[PDB]
Scaffold this active site. Structure first.
Site, short mmCIF file in Angstrom:
data_model
loop_
_atom_site.label_atom_id
_atom_site.label_comp_id
_atom_site.label_asym_id
_atom_site.label_seq_id
_atom_site.Cartn_x
_atom_site.Cartn_y
_atom_site.Cartn_z
N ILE B 111 0.83 -1.19 0.00
CA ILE B 111 0.00 0.00 0.00
C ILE B 111 0.86 1.24 0.00
CG2 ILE B 111 -1.44 1.48 1.50
CD1 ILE B 111 -3.16 -0.90 2.04
N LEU B 115 0.18 2.81 -3.46
CA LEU B 115 -0.96 3.71 -3.36
C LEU B 115 -0.56 5.04 -2.75
CD1 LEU B 115 -3.80 1.26 -2.33
CD2 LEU B 115 -2.98 1.91 -4.62
N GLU B 116 0.24 5.01 -1.68
CA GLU B 116 0.68 6.28 -1.10
C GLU B 116 1.71 6.98 -2.02
OE1 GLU B 116 -1.24 7.34 1.79
OE2 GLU B 116 -2.11 5.47 1.03
N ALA B 117 2.50 6.17 -2.71
CA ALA B 117 3.40 6.69 -3.75
C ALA B 117 2.64 7.34 -4.89
CB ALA B 117 4.29 5.56 -4.27
N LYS B 119 -0.17 8.90 -4.58
CA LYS B 119 -0.82 10.10 -4.04
C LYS B 119 0.12 11.29 -3.87
CE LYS B 119 -3.30 7.21 -1.25
NZ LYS B 119 -4.09 7.08 0.02
#
Ligand SMILES: OC[C@H]1O[C@@H](O[C@H]2[C@H](O)[C@@H](O)[C@H](O)O[C@@H]2CO)[C@H](O)[C@@H](O)[C@H]1O
Ligand SMILES: OC[C@H]1O[C@@H](O[C@H]2[C@H](O)[C@@H](O)[C@H](O)O[C@@H]2CO)[C@H](O)[C@@H](O)[C@H]1O
Ligand SMILES: CC(=O)N[C@@H]1[C@@H](O)[C@H](O)[C@@H](CO)O[C@H]1O
Lengths: 264, 206, 41
Positions: B111, B115-117, B119
């Site tokens: 994640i 996903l945080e990368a 964002k």
């Protein structure tokens, strides 16, 4: 968790990290605007409103040649006309009254107690401001193509991408409220779009900071390091070759050579 | 179509397919390649069960896709788990093998690194540096503050459009020397450079 | 959108994050040039 924001109080900072400051805390209708070093004073604090006014000390920021001349000044909102106290902040640092369409808030020299003025919009380092209560310059590295950091090189005269090093003093930069990217060790040095060119585009390099429109830069949502204004050009390693050791300000095609990252 | 699939293959050519809820930008489910089992977070949306991985035995995992639940389930904090090429590799394998004792931590790697990368460009570059320099990192406050504040940042970006780019409320972020920046307006590169995708809150125009 | 680790570097990793962002992020709706996530797909 609401999207309407009615009233707000922040402070306005600019060139060389100086704050927009009402002259001597004086409250009378027609009191002068100056740059002053930042601090926790009610004259430096500014409150934005849904109508479009920006106030300090109960009275709105105002601009009019017929009343006050070139100068910028706080005045009572109910007595004054409607048009001379509307304001607008733009993403690349421009504070301006929409009713005076050619003009822009400006500090003519960078040094304490300068009177602020409305001047013709050239999108200059001086005409650029950061609105926000955090007034200190944002220190960090700038990372460009192939994970190379921007390096202030050659006794701090010429700038190009080099391979990252942890805490190299010259590889860190300091992005100031005015728009300028200053060197971390030295703040009198700053980033600039020089008159010497490559393939009909201007070479970017360091010079002493004067506050001209060669020196104002904005970090855009697309990840470019760009000039302000409707016409846009961005920072650019020329042809993605780090070996050439030169960054050119170019038409924003928006490829990897024009991609950058503030690694704070 | 409400969900978005992407595939992560390992150093042994072991592939999993992960499913992202486009609405909230979270992982809801995944399937190991050539497996009749598929695995769903406890708080995965109903539609996901009804639409994704229909040709499989759909198992409900023992945690939700929230950070708090993944951290309590892995027994550690994001502030402890290291990220990098190799720990990613390992996390992929663990999800392929469906190892229950590792899963929550295996997700915390995936994640964060995907996903945080997506964002935040700061997180993207922190991860790219692991690949470049061959060496891993465990996130400090700077990455943790962005991760934790994504939804609030998104809401405040959208909110600022009703008042000259100023936020409704201060948003505390940290720099890479763990120093506090109280951000309260759009006019910081910390926000404007950084945020690459924003969570919808309100219908507003710029 | 396949990221294969066995032959991965910062280049292909960035192109991958690139693909995630391009397919998740709206073309039409952006604010200050930051895209809002897509309504559908
Ligand atoms: O004059 C500009 C300047 O005023 C400072 O406050 C002054 C005040 O005007 C003066 O009457 C008093 O004697 O000294 C004060 C400073 O100690 C503000 O602090 C500064 O921001 C400017 O606005
Ligand atoms: O060299 C600066 C310049 O590159 C242009 O792209 C070049 C490319 O570098 C070169 O390999 C190729 O042969 O020609 C291209 C131009 O047709 C960029 O377009 C320009 O923005 C600069 O970055
Ligand atoms: C050099 C000089 O004249 N400096 C002026 C001062 O005289 C004036 O009172 C003030 C407000 O107008 O602006 C400044």
């Amino acid at each position: 968790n609401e999207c309407l924001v009615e009233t707000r109080t922040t402070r306005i900072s600019g060139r060389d990290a100086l704050c927009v400051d009402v002259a001597g805390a004086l409250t009378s209708d027609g009191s002068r605007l100056i740059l002053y070093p930042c601090g926790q004073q009610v004259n430096q604090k500014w409150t934005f409103h849904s109508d479009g006014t920006v106030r300090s000390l109960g009275k709105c920021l105002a601009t009019n040649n017929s009343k006050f001349g070139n100068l910028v000044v706080i005045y009572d909102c109910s007595k004054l006309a409607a048009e001379d106290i509307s304001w607008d902040v733009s993403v690349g640092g421009t504070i301006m009254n929409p009713n005076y369409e050619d003009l822009a808030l400006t500090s003519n020299k960078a040094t304490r107690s300068t009177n602020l003025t409305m001047e013709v919009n050239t999108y200059s380092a001086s005409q650029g401001w950061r609105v926000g209560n955090y007034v200190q310059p944002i220190i960090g590295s700038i990372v460009g193509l192939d994970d190379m950091c921007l390096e202030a090189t050659d006794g701090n005269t010429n700038m190009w991408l080099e391979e990252c090093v942890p805490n190299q003093r010259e590889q860190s930069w300091a992005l100031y409220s005015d728009g300028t990217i200053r060197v971390d060790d030295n703040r009198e040095l700053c980033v600039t779009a020089s008159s010497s060119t490559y393939d009909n585009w201007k070479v970017i390099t360091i010079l002493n900071c004067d506050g001209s429109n060669n020196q104002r830069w904005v970090f855009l949502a697309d990840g470019s390091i760009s000039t302000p204004g409707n016409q846009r050009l961005a920072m650019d390693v020329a042809r993605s070759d780090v070996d050439l050791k030169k960054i050119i300000l170019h038409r924003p095609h928006g490829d990897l050579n024009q991609q950058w990252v503030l690694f704070y | 179509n409400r969900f978005y699939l992407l595939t992560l293959t390992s150093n042994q050519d072991e592939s999993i397919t992960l499913a992202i809820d486009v609405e909230d930008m979270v992982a809801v489910a995944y399937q190991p390649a050539g497996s009749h089992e598929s695995y769903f977070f406890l708080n995965a949306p109903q539609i996901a069960f009804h639409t994704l991985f229909t040709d499989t035995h759909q198992n409900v995992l023992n945690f939700d896709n929230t950070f708090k639940s993944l951290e309590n389930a892995a027994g550690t904090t994001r502030q402890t788990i290291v990220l990098g090429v190799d720990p990613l590799d390992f996390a992929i394998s663990n999800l392929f093998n469906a190892d229950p004792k590792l899963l929550p931590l295996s997700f915390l790697v995936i994640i964060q690194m995907v996903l945080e990368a997506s964002k935040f460009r700061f997180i993207e570059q922190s991860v790219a540096y692991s690949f470049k320099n061959e060496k891993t990192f465990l996130p400090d406050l700077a990455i943790v503050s962005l991760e934790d504040n994504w939804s609030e940042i998104s809401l405040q970006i959208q909110a600022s459009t009703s008042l000259q780019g100023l936020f409704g409320s201060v948003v505390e972020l940290y720099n890479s020397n763990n120093e506090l920046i109280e951000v309260d307006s759009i006019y910081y590169p910390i926000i404007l450079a950084n945020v690459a995708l924003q969570l919808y809150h309100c219908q507003v125009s710029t | 959108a396949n990221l294969r680790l066995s032959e991965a570097n910062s280049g292909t990793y960035k192109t991958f994050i690139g693909r995630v962002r391009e397919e998740l992020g709206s073309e039409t709706y952006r604010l200050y040039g930051i895209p809002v996530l897509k309504h559908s797909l």
